Design an enzyme around this catalytic site. Structure first.
Site, PDB file in Angstrom:
ATOM      1  N   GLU A  35      -1.165 -51.968 -25.922  1.00  0.00           N
ATOM      2  CA  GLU A  35       0.343 -51.453 -26.429  1.00  0.00           C
ATOM      3  C   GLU A  35       0.245 -50.206 -27.176  1.00  0.00           C
ATOM      4  O   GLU A  35       0.909 -49.340 -26.976  1.00  0.00           O
ATOM      5  CB  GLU A  35       0.613 -52.647 -27.398  1.00  0.00           C
ATOM      6  N   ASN A  46      12.329 -46.622 -25.495  1.00  0.00           N
ATOM      7  CA  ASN A  46      12.693 -47.648 -24.465  1.00  0.00           C
ATOM      8  C   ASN A  46      13.718 -47.026 -23.510  1.00  0.00           C
ATOM      9  O   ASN A  46      14.394 -46.289 -24.280  1.00  0.00           O
ATOM     10  CB  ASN A  46      12.753 -49.153 -24.891  1.00  0.00           C
ATOM     11  N   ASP A  48      16.425 -48.539 -22.997  1.00  0.00           N
ATOM     12  CA  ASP A  48      17.579 -49.178 -23.638  1.00  0.00           C
ATOM     13  C   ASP A  48      18.144 -48.292 -24.827  1.00  0.00           C
ATOM     14  O   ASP A  48      18.931 -48.516 -25.443  1.00  0.00           O
ATOM     15  CB  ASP A  48      17.680 -50.608 -23.815  1.00  0.00           C
ATOM     16  N   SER A  50      16.187 -48.598 -27.488  1.00  0.00           N
ATOM     17  CA  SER A  50      15.345 -49.211 -28.857  1.00  0.00           C
ATOM     18  C   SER A  50      14.087 -48.255 -28.525  1.00  0.00           C
ATOM     19  O   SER A  50      13.773 -47.588 -27.715  1.00  0.00           O
ATOM     20  CB  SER A  50      15.374 -50.917 -28.411  1.00  0.00           C
ATOM     21  N   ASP A  52       9.897 -49.069 -29.620  1.00  0.00           N
ATOM     22  CA  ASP A  52       8.658 -49.931 -30.076  1.00  0.00           C
ATOM     23  C   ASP A  52       7.666 -49.348 -31.044  1.00  0.00           C
ATOM     24  O   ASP A  52       7.362 -48.018 -31.014  1.00  0.00           O
ATOM     25  CB  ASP A  52       7.849 -50.034 -28.960  1.00  0.00           C
ATOM     26  N   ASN A  59       9.420 -54.301 -31.077  1.00  0.00           N
ATOM     27  CA  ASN A  59      10.629 -53.533 -30.478  1.00  0.00           C
ATOM     28  C   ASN A  59      12.102 -53.528 -31.559  1.00  0.00           C
ATOM     29  O   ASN A  59      12.028 -54.669 -32.216  1.00  0.00           O
ATOM     30  CB  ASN A  59      10.942 -53.990 -29.337  1.00  0.00           C
TER      31      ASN A  59
END
Ligand SMILES: [Cl-]
Ligand SMILES: [Cl-]
Length: 129
Positions: A35, A46, A48, A50, A52, A59
């Site tokens: 990650e 992301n 969308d 959003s 992380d 998220n």
């Protein structure tokens, strides 16, 4: 902060992640490796809109507030910036909530794709702990 492998394993163990919801320590270290490469400052946007955050790439759609993710929740009750700290307490506490949500560590797509079904104990092998 960029953690060492065994350093991060120790910090996670101290904060009660080894065997949390049945997931051995090596699962958590493997997840963090893919990650964030063990970098507490890792951020990634992301599709969308959003974002992380942190060592476990938590998220903003559900778990923290960043002020810029429309229609989102803040289920860990934390600003997303707390997830970038050198102290992993906030990331660990919020990861405990995530992994309890019903799908276990499959919540982390990179864990499913890169850790699940592998020799995850390799990630803590040789570490004093
Ligand atoms: Cl393990
Ligand atoms: Cl599970």
């Amino acid at each position: 902060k960029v953690f060492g492998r065994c350093e991060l394993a120790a910090a996670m163990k101290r904060h009660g992640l080894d065997n949390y919801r049945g997931y051995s320590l090596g699962n958590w270290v493997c997840a963090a490796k893919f990650e964030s490469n063990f970098n507490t400052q890792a951020t990634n946007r992301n599709t969308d809109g959003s974002t992380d955050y942190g060592i476990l790439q938590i998220n903003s759609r559900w778990w923290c507030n960043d002020g810029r993710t429309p229609g989102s929740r803040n289920l860990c009750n934390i600003p997303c910036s707390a997830l970038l700290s050198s102290d992993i307490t906030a990331s660990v506490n919020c990861a405990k909530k995530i992994v309890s949500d019903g799908n276990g560590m499959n919540a982390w797509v990179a864990w499913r794709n890169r850790c699940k079904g592998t020799d995850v104990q390799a990630w803590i092998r040789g570490c004093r702990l």
